Amino acid sequence: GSHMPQIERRIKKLISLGKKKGYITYEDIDKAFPPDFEGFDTNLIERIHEELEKHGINIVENEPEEEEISAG
């Protein structure tokens, strides 16, 4: 279950769609639907976030996973 170049492209497309839609957000991709997704893959979800770090693709979770003392 490898050899998926369409994944690499799709990730960039997904972030691009949200960027087109307005915000670079996981939910904004959902609102971009229908997207360019050739396949829906659980692998894609992890692969998006890895490409996010290694490739640098800008996308936000919208989730406040940047929190401390609950004052911001």
UniProtKB/Swiss-Prot annotation:
<comment type="function">
    <text>Sigma factors are initiation factors that promote the attachment of RNA polymerase to specific initiation sites and are then released. This sigma factor is the primary sigma factor during exponential growth.</text>
</comment>
<comment type="similarity">
    <text>Belongs to the sigma-70 factor family. RpoD/SigA subfamily.</text>
</comment>
<protein>
    <recommendedName>
        <fullName>RNA polymerase sigma factor SigA</fullName>
    </recommendedName>
</protein>
<comment type="subunit">
    <text>Interacts transiently with the RNA polymerase catalytic core.</text>
</comment>
<feature type="region of interest" description="Sigma-70 factor domain-1">
    <location>
        <begin position="6"/>
        <end position="72"/>
    </location>
</feature>
